Amino acid sequence: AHHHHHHSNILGITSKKIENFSDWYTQVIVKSELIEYYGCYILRPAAYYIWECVQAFFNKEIKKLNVENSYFPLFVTSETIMYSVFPKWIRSYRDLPLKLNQWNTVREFLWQEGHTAHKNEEEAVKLVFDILDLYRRWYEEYLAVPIIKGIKSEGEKFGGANFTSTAEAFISENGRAIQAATSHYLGTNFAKMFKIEFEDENEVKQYVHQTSWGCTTRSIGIMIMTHGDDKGLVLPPNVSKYKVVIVPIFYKTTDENAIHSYCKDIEKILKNAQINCVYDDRASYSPGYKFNHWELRGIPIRIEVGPKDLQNNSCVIVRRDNNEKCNVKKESVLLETQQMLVDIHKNLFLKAKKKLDDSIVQVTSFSEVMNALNKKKMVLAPWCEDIATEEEIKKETQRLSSGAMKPLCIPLDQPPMPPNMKCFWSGKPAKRWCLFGRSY
């Protein structure tokens, strides 16, 4: 029977995140046991657990908004056959609002999409932004990922939408923006197509006002790209099944019982407090092997117990995000573990938010744009918002370079627009600031 002292190089991540991002990413998602390639792939329990966590959150919150889950099995190329059925369900204002959500399966295999119909515009638009903030919370509170809320340009919004609001994320390592979630105000467009009308409170016939919104497992990919490091997966505590791994350290059989017993004590303390954890008591693997093994898998906290800790009635607690270590007295393990899990999430989010902030360069002229893109940034630019310019900006940025930059979103949070500020592209008067970047 073989003892494994050293976790071999090949079993760890062999590509650095900064030097080979694409290979780094595929190594992390497979070697961390998130997915298994069969170009389709399987969501193993560690991946599905993340989805199930954000699913539970989102379900709870949309039910407070009276959204009802449902399942519509018929799709067309991808969109759900649905709106043509709405006239069968809506005749008067008493039938409104209609609020539906579906959890679907099908490069991303799972997603959520919601659809609503309202008696007026203001209700529909309120819901669009309520859902958009729920997506902010999905990303921030669970995935520790910062996003930017905004409105898509006319050229990039959904064709059937009056406007498309979006949550935008940014992958700093390769300078790529990514649409993180979307929430559309569809106006009366589909109501006119399918005669989705109702008798209002004044006995006047009206069209319904619709919304739709969705988010996919892309969210998990964004999270991994954000927090992952050269040791592998890094998980916000809220989406890791095990919060803590306990690793026994001993080399003499005379220490085995006391170390094992003490580790079980700590395991009991945590699990009794509803903090799930794993005690890795495998005899065939060294402590050092186990350190690497569980870092690769993204466990937020490691607790080490060796003979020194027995003698000091302590233990060593190591954080996955920054590898900082501290000695903790046994009776303090529960509280310090609770506080550390909170601090790990806060640190993950704040570090990511700083990187997002530093990824945005405010420009006023197109001459500043290429320098920005090559530093893997996106730009915030004053823009006339003329739809014709969108393809012109893309084509030119492609030329001066998949290389092109496109309008990402017009952020809800707008800096002041100086009185005479011109469009960075057309020279025409600028209207608002818009984010532009290379994208997925």
Binding site for ligand 3O6 (CB under 6 A): 25, 29, 34-35, 43, 47, 50, 107-108, 178, 217-218, 220-222, 224-225, 440
Per partner kind, with CB cut-offs from 5 to 8 A, the member of Cl ion, ligand 3O6, Mg ion, none near residue 221 is: ligand 3O6
Which of 296, 292, 297, 281 is CA-nearest to residue 7? 292
**Cα distances (Å, whole numbers) of residue 315 to 139, 229, 325:** 33, 26, 10
Q: Residue of minimal CB distance from Cl ion? A: 84
Q: Are 372 and 361 in contact (CB under 8 A)?
A: yes
Per partner kind, with CB cut-offs from 5 to 8 A, the member of Cl ion, Mg ion, ligand 3O6, none near residue 102 is: Mg ion
Per partner kind, with CB cut-offs from 5 to 8 A, the member of Cl ion, Mg ion, ligand 3O6, none near residue 276 is: none
Which of 438, 20, 21 is CA-nearest to residue 221? 21
**Cα distances (Å, whole numbers) of residue 172 to 21, 108, 232, 287, 398:** 11, 22, 17, 34, 20
Q: How far is the CB of 111 from Cl ion (least distance, A)?
A: 18
Per partner kind, with CB cut-offs from 5 to 8 A, the member of Mg ion, Cl ion, ligand 3O6, none near residue 191 is: none
Which of 213, 200, 198 is CA-nearest to residue 87? 198
Under the binding rule (CB under 5 A), the answer on residue 193 touching Cl ion is no
3-state secondary structure of 244: strand
Q: How far is the CB of 200 from Cl ion (least distance, A)?
A: 24
Q: Which CB sits closer to ligand 3O6, 223 or 328?
A: 223
Q: Are strands 244-248 and 301-305 parallel, antiparallel or unpaired?
A: parallel
Under the binding rule (CB under 5 A), the answer on residue 189 touching Mg ion is no
Residue 193 burial (CB count, 10 A): 11
Per partner kind, with CB cut-offs from 5 to 8 A, the member of Mg ion, ligand 3O6, Cl ion, none near residue 342 is: none
Q: How far is the CB of 156 from Mg ion (least distance, A)?
A: 23
Under the binding rule (CB under 5 A), the answer on residue 102 touching Mg ion is yes
Three-class HEC string of 307-363: HHHHHHCEEEEEECCCCCEEEEEHHHHHHHHHHHHHHHHHHHHHHHHHHHHHCEEEC
Q: CB under 5 A: which stretch of 74-82, 105-113, 339-347, 370-378 binds Cl ion?
A: 74-82
| Residue 12 DSSP symbol | S
Q: Which CB sits closer to Cl ion, 84 or 365?
A: 84
Instruction: Give the DSSP H or E segment for 91.
Output: none
Q: Which of 15, 55, 59, 80 binds Mg ion (CB under 5 A)?
A: 80
Per partner kind, with CB cut-offs from 5 to 8 A, the member of Cl ion, ligand 3O6, Mg ion, none near residue 67 is: none
Give the list of residues 6+ apart from residue 274 with CB closer than 8 angstroms, or none.
none
Q: Which CB sits closer to Mg ion, 114 or 298?
A: 114
Annotated binding-site residue? 206: no
Annotated binding-site residue? 55: no
Phi, psi of 213 (to 5 degrees): -165, 150
| Cα–Cα distance, 146 to 138 (Å, whole number) | 10
Annotated binding-site residue? 438: no
Q: Which CB sits closer to Cl ion, 74 or 283?
A: 74
Annotated binding-site residue? 372: no
Per partner kind, with CB cut-offs from 5 to 8 A, the member of ligand 3O6, Mg ion, Cl ion, none near residue 250 is: none
Per partner kind, with CB cut-offs from 5 to 8 A, the member of ligand 3O6, Cl ion, Mg ion, none near residue 80 is: Mg ion
Q: How far is CA 192 from its chain centroid?
A: 35
Q: Which CB sits closer to ligand 3O6, 178 or 259?
A: 178
Q: Number of helices and strands (H, E) in the chain?
A: 12, 22
Annotated binding-site residue? 181: yes
Q: Are strands 244-248 and 277-279 parallel, antiparallel or unpaired?
A: parallel
Q: Which of 84, 312, 339, 401 binds Cl ion (CB under 5 A)?
A: 84
Instruction: Give the DSSP H or E segment for 224.
Output: helix 218-227
Binding annotation for L-proline? 184
Binding annotation? 107-109, 179-181, 184, 216-218
- Contacting residues toward Mg ion, per CB under 5 A: 72, 80, 102
Binding annotation for ATP? 107-109, 179-181, 216-218
- Contacting residues toward Cl ion, per CB under 5 A: 81, 83-84
